Structure 1
């Protein structure tokens, strides 16, 4: 199974909340954005956070989110 833990979800949620205008639907673009605007020690965590940011962008584009 591929279920994101609470650290990835909280990091992606505060990334969506705090830096919203400089984002997009491309995984590599917001991957580089999350590389530069935060400090992630590893790379798998960076890729998982960027993927959840992309999914949250696709969710915001349809409507509001209660987080």
Structure 2
């Protein structure tokens, strides 16, 4: 019931980690002193505060990603797992499932491939008022 950090903390801390994820750590007093080395801070308290939020952010990072940030190793991992390809789905093995109306479409477009037809479904009653 009091202490929220200002953006002058939260920016610095966000940026610092973006640039020194490596040297930074969960152990506070180590990375309290890191933040003195890598960043030119004017005051003691602000230094000390920045480092706090840094140690708050190091804790989050160790548990999935964060929205407003970019770790170099996470981006590489994301890149790998956003060019993933298995041996393909949109061939839909042998036998694609299909309607008569689609089959009528495909007759009109000159097609009769390996696709199987099925309807029963009587005009039901879609949604309810």
Q: Calculate the TM-score normalised by the size of structure 2.
A: 0.51
Higher relative contact order (CA 8 A, sep 6+): 1
The unaligned stretches of length 5 or more in structure 1 are none
1:19-46 CA-to-partner distances (Å, cap 9, x unmatched) read: 1111111110001100000111100000
Runs of 4+ in 1 over 2 A off after TM superposition: none
Number of residue pairs matched by the alignment? 67
Q: CA RMSD in A?
A: 0.5
- 1:62, 1:21 → 2: CA distance? 16
- 2:20, 2:26 → 1: CA distance? 14
Q: Calculate the TM-score normalised by the size of structure 1.
A: 0.97
